[PDB]
RNA sequence: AUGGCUGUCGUCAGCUCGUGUUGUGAAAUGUUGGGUUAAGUCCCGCAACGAGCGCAACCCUUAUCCUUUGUUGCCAGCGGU
């Protein structure tokens, strides 16, 4: 399973940001400029998207763990259902500095969630004071919407998928410290030197990111099968 | 030379740690920021994530009612003074 050339063109994958934000480390990923904004050379993209997709299908068959990362509301929910298809792990709201490097801390932050999840089922809040019931409930929405998508990780992922290494450069700096391959969809204004398998393109369009993770959800099903 | 015990800034609201992270390093980060509160009190944000001593609470007393008991306490409903 792979993506075609013109199907991504209808989504606007070539459309980048203004030339007032571009990063000079991507000159080999630039086609030209139209209306003072950059245009991404997609003929370079498709092959560079497939050497990554061929590598991603390798670790999916070995039953490794991947991680989708997206912290922008214009794509924050498309990454959720994408992770629901290939039942892998994801973080769609806020990347806490320490999901990988400080995993020894967030692991006990996990047990804070589980017992609170199960006692929210046996009827413990009908036994508690309404103020403590207000306390244990308000924190439940905060934790489930922060690390709820990585609640069944069981350790460290064998891979990690990123969206825009410019806004999420906190994640790419951590992933390199543990020795984990990084697959990012670096926009034209980001520095892709911290990514192993770089993929030029746009993401500020909801229809654009649906092409990506959907295809990533496909390759994982090829692997787990 | 000390222990134990006390005053004191101050009943002011602060003081630190583990891990991660930034810096050659002293250290920084968290503990800053937007509001708010008696209060690093609480929420959101955030390379920080949690934790501890404190803060508050749990304690005593006082302000209201109910239940239980009625002496040497007390005096309404009834008699003798």
From Swiss-Prot:
Xref: InterPro entries: Ribosomal_uS2 (IPR001865), Ribosomal_uS2_bac/mit/plastid (IPR005706), Ribosomal_uS2_CS (IPR018130), Ribosomal_uS2_flav_dom_sf (IPR023591)
Keyword Ribosomal protein applies: yes
GO CC, alphabetical: cytoplasm; cytosolic small ribosomal subunit
UniProt GO molecular function: structural constituent of ribosome; zinc ion binding
Domain of life: Bacteria
Keywords linked to the UniProt accession: Ribonucleoprotein, Ribosomal protein
N6-succinyllysine found at: 114
Keyword Ribonucleoprotein belongs to the record: yes
SUPFAM superfamilies tied to this protein: Ribosomal protein S2 (SSF52313)
Gene Ontology terms: biological process: cytoplasmic translation; ribosomal small subunit assembly
Family membership noted in the UniProt record: Belongs to the universal ribosomal protein uS2 family.
Cross-referenced PANTHER family: 30S RIBOSOMAL PROTEIN S2 PROKARYOTIC AND ORGANELLAR, SMALL RIBOSOMAL SUBUNIT PROTEIN US2M
Biological role stated in the UniProt entry: Required for ribosomal protein bS1 (rpsA) to bind to the 30S subunit.
Complex formation: Part of the 30S ribosomal subunit, contacts bS1. Some nascent polypeptide chains are able to cross-link to this protein in situ. In collided ribosomes contacts ribosome rescue factor SmrB.
Protein name per UniProt: Small ribosomal subunit protein uS2
Species in which this protein is naturally found: Escherichia coli (strain K12)
Name of the encoding gene: rpsB
């Amino acid at each position: 399973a792979t993506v075609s050339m013109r199907d991504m063109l209808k989504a606007g994958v070539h459309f980048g940001h203004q030339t007032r934000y571009w990063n000079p480390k991507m000159k080999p990923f630039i086609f030209g400029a139209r209306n003072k904004v950059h245009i991404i050379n997609l003929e370079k993209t498709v092959p560079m998207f497939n050497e990554a997709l061929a590598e991603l299908n390798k670790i999916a068959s070995r039953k490794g763990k991947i991680l989708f990362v997206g912290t922008k509301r214009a794509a924050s929910e498309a990454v959720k259902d994408a992770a629901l298809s290939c039942d892998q792990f994801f973080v769609n709201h806020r990347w806490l500095g320490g999901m990988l490097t400080n995993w020894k801390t967030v692991r006990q932050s996990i047990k804070r969630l589980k017992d609170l999840e199960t006692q929210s089922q046996d009827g413990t809040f009908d036994k508690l004071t309404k103020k403590e019931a207000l306390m244990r409930t308000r924190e439940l929405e905060k934790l489930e919407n922060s690390l709820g998508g990585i609640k069944d990780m069981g350790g460290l992922p064998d891979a990690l998928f990123v969206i825009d290494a410019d806004h999420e450069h906190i994640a790419i700096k951590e992933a390199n410290n543990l020795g984990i391959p990084v697959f990012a969809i670096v926009d034209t204004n980001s520095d892709p030197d911290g990514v192993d398998f770089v993929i030029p393109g746009n993401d500020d369009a909801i229809r654009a990111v649906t092409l990506y993770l959907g295809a990533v959800a496909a390759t994982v099903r090829e692997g787990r099968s």
